[model samples]
Target: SEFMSVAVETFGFFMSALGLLMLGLTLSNSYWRVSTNTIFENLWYSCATDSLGVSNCWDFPSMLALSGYVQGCRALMITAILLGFLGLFLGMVGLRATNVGNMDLSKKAKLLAIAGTLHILAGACGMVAISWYAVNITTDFFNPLYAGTKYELGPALYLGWSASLLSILGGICVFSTAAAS
Candidate 1:
């Protein structure tokens, strides 16, 4: 049971890092395409790049800060990252094998619970951000006025989705069994 606690905490830590990586990728790339009337050129949509060429990259943080969907994604993902880091710190202190925190079982259990809860919220935030972005893309792509260009999902979406699920699962494991011992 002690080992089980360690295993779950370790997994939660991994998932936290993975989720952050996915969000980072999503925030940086402009692979999401929004095609237009042009035949040879397509518009690349992202928090940063709005078109082809590296020189065209916008300061996405500032640009996206004003947009609703981008802001939502940004706020949620960032919150997730902060929470994940907090969870990891608490988890490290809570580990059964760690000499820190006096190895106090009861205190460790409480810390684990708190970490697990943070992980859960992190996953939820990630999912909401991803889904919101996806829905917006779908809606805009199908609009009749935008028929000239076709929209496509990007690699970041896929990566973020997978990582979000892993985070949720890891959170569940920690929440359910971290304190069982």
Candidate 2:
């Protein structure tokens, strides 16, 4: 029997990994919006599928030429991803079962808190990016003057939003270690 807190840490670690997977999908998979004409729009590219399921993708034209909001969203998401990865490792090293560091329980507790805080920060960034992107999409979709292809929310947005929650919850779980003297 290692400790009672081991299971909680394990669960949080699992949640962090789950959230990390969703974040990766959100960043890499193209499907932030879907239009009636079968056009799938994403952060970095647009794709359309033929009747036979053949797909063609057009990458976003330029990096420096993109709008401020688009770049900011990307930056936020990337930061979130990096933070998640670092937190995951910190979690692994700081767990009660880990022997990476000497048996300084107080230091281990601090490490756990730091890891949890990082996860929560990642969650905050993801939430801000996803909500901002969604709001802009909704605004453009409803506006009359903006005569462009109207797209609806896609699976990526839903997944990113849920990941935000999972990340935060996981961080909370790890935070409980603060009192584990």
Candidate 3:
């Protein structure tokens, strides 16, 4: 249990860094423009889901190449990205409260847990949506060597997994708030 706690904390630390990077990139106009600067639309009449961290019309090109469907997809991607950061924040809060050892702080910790849970849920939704679109809607998104068989660890692959895992951990942490007091 103790080891698991430490591991969770480590994961939280890594997530925090990733969140900060996302936040920073989102704030920068040049970066944001890259992702959003697309004219293609996916299945929907609008835009597909995307992280939109540094580019607009996130995954627009791929969607165009694949199903050519876009509409409300990018929103899911954004939700996932935002929730990932929120989870990281809650994890940090939980850690801080634990280090302090106070009832008031612990209460805040519990709230943090709840926040983490919601974050996880939102991020997981996005992660699943992205994967579904990439696989079902688009063909070669995963780079399948033998018809979606390849499992090489790459940026796109890890990003999807990491986002999903972080979201799940965040949700679990939030539910743990029940025992906080």
TM-score for each of the candidates: 0.77, 0.90, 0.48
Write one digit per residue (lDDT tens) for candidate 3, span 45-116: 222234463434443355553453223445665665666567555555666436544546557657566666
* TM-score of candidate 3 relative to the true fold: 0.48
Error of 3 at 107 (Å): 1.6
Displacement of the residue 134 alpha carbon in candidate 3, Å: 1.8
* lDDT head-to-head 2 vs 3, winner: 2
Please report how far candidate 1 places residue 167 from its true position, in Å.
1.1
Quick one: ranking by lDDT, best first? 2, 1, 3
Tell me the deviation in Å of residue 106 in model 1. 1.1
What lDDT score belongs to each candidate, Candidate 1 first? 0.66, 0.83, 0.47
Best by lDDT: 2
RMSD of 1: 4.3
| TM-score of decoy 1 | 0.77
lDDT of 2 by residue, 1-181 (tens): 3465777888887897789778888988688888843798777887898887888999765653265466778888999999999888887788877899586888888888988988889888999989988998898888989887888988899999999889988988887864564
TM-score, prediction 2: 0.90
